[PDB]
A paper describes a structure:
Here, we report the isolation of nanobodies that bind to the Omicron BA.1 spike protein by screening nanobody phage display libraries previously generated from llamas immunized with either the Wuhan or Beta spike proteins. The structure and binding properties of three of these nanobodies (A8, H6 and B5-5) have been characterized in detail providing insight into their binding epitopes on the Omicron spike protein. Structural analyses have mapped out the epitopes of these nanobodies on the RBD and have shown that the majority cluster in two regions: one on the side of the RBD, distal from the human angiotensin converting enzyme-2 (ACE-2) receptor binding interface (cluster 1), while the second are close to or at the ACE-2 binding region (cluster 2).
H6 was crystallized in complex with the Beta-RBD, whereas A8 and B5-5 were solved in complex with the Wuhan RBD. Three datasets were collected and merged from a single crystal for the B5-5 WuhRBD structure. A8 binds on the side of the RBD at a similar location to other nanobodies including VHH72 and C1(1) that sterically prevent ACE-2 binding (Cluster 1(21) nanobodies), whereas B5-5 binds on the opposite side of the RBD at a location that does not overlap with the ACE-2 binding region. By contrast to other regions of the RBD, there are only a few other nanobodies reported that bind to this face of the domain suggesting that it may be less immunogenic than other parts of the RBD. The epitope recognized by A8 is located between RBD residues Y369 to K378 and binding is largely mediated through hydrogen bonding, with E113 in CDR3 of A8 forming a hydrogen bond network with S375, T376 and K378, and R56 in CDR2 with Y369, N370 and S371. Both CDR2 and CDR3 of B5-5 make key interactions with RBD, notably salt bridges between R54 (B5-5) and D428 (RBD), and hydrogen bonding involving D428 (RBD) and Y55 in CDR2 and Y396 (RBD) with R99 in CDR3. The sequence of the epitope recognized by B5-5 is highly conserved among all SARS-CoV-2 variants, including Omicron BA.4/5 maintaining key interactions. This is consistent with the observation that B5-5 binds to BA.1 and BA.4/5 with similar kinetics but does not account for the 10-fold reduction in affinity compared with binding to the Beta RBD. With the RBD in the ‘up’ conformation, the cryptic epitope becomes accessible though binding of B5-5 would still impose a clash with the adjacent S1-NTD.
Residue numbers in the entry:
A (entry chain A): 331 to 528
B (entry chain B): 1, 3 to 124
The structure:
């Protein structure tokens, strides 16, 4: 059988999380998952499912589960869904239209914001094209916004492509950090490896 | 049944660019993802980049920042890895690998079919 307990703690309670442009992914497999316990393991401000009902997860078996995690601002959580547009969905992390999975988020102001600004979390602000679904672009090429070629140097109209969120504790919640975990539930014509307790 | 062929390896000079291609024969499905790995002398295999065929989506590992491009040539039907500024430290065995479905990763143990690997040696 499968007998290991799925290692969600590894992803949900990582003490550091990725910048959204550099989002992390962990494949989960060969384990037993209890999604109700997971849901009542903390207080998620968002727990939203596509292609499946949250109430059924413990009855299903998947070929694999993937967990993508990162930090964004509160107001951008709405962008982590199929069919959305905006700087995050367009340039940093894009879900496919046929996505099947859950999007889970919670407010991480106590952890991720620093008095006079945490500048360590970054997002991609400029890009020549929109991401394809599940594209991961970590490049740092200088973006040419004007007529004048950049030759790889920050300048007038030549922009470093990543901007720091700078989370501060007294920000409005829109502009407070949220941790996000996206769980994709994959079904292929192959033996199931991730099941519920029954 | 699935067999993977790497093309483009061998002896290269520092400074030029390298184009490796991965050709996939006998796949039972079209919905799969293609990873590129290298193995430096005396180290573990490490993932560089992965391409999701369904989503047309490149996925770069932290180690591939700013030198490697992964893409698909729909004419040759290959998944290609381009390395731009060859240094002697680029000398290694490069492999391509596949996994089923559209989810890329650059982790060795997530792929089940491998090519034989191709020696790249930088002068
Ligand atoms: C770790 O996450 C699990 C759920 O995955 C939760 O039950 C646990 O309490 C978390 N961390 C702490 C501080 O215990």
């Amino acid at each position: 059988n499968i007998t290991n307990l799925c290692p969600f703690g590894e992803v949900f309670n990582a003490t550091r999380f990725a910048s959204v442009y550099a989002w992390n992914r962990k494949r989960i497999s060969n384990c037993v998952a209890d999604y109700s316990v997971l849901y009542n393991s903390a207080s998620f401000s968002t727990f939203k499912c596509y292609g499946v009902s949250p109430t059924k997860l413990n009855d299903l078996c998947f070929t694999n589960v993937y967990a993508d995690s990162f930090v964004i601002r509160g107001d951008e959580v709405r962008q982590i869904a199929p069919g959305q547009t905006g700087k995050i969905a367009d340039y940093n992390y894009k879900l496919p239209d046929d996505f099947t999975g859950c999007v889970i988020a919670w407010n991480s102001n106590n952890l991720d914001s620093k008095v006079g600004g945490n500048y360590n979390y970054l997002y991609r602000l400029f890009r020549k094209s929109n991401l394809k679904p599940f594209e991961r672009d970590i490049s740092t090429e200088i973006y040419q916004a004007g007529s004048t070629p950049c030759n790889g140097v920050e300048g007038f109209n030549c922009y470093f492509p990543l901007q720091s969120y700078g989370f501060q504790p007294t920000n409005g919640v829109g502009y407070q950090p949220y941790r996000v975990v996206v769980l994709s539930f994959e079904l292929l014509h192959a033996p199931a490896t991730v099941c519920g307790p029954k | 049944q699935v067999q993977l062929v790497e093309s483009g390896g061998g002896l290269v000079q520092p400074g030029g660019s390298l184009r490796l291609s991965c050709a996939v024969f006998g796949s039972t499905l079209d919905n799969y993802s293609v990873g590129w790995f290298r193995q430096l002398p005396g180290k573990e295999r490490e993932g560089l980049a992965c391409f999701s065929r369904r989503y047309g989506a490149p996925y770069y590992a932290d180690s591939a920042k700013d030198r490697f491009t992964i893409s698909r040539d729909n004419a040759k039907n290959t998944v290609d890895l381009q390395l731009n500024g060859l240094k002697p430290e680029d000398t290694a065995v490069y492999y391509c690998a596949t996994r089923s479905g559209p989810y890329c990763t650059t982790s060795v143990s997530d792929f089940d079919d491998w090519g034989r690997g191709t020696q790249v040696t930088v002068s």
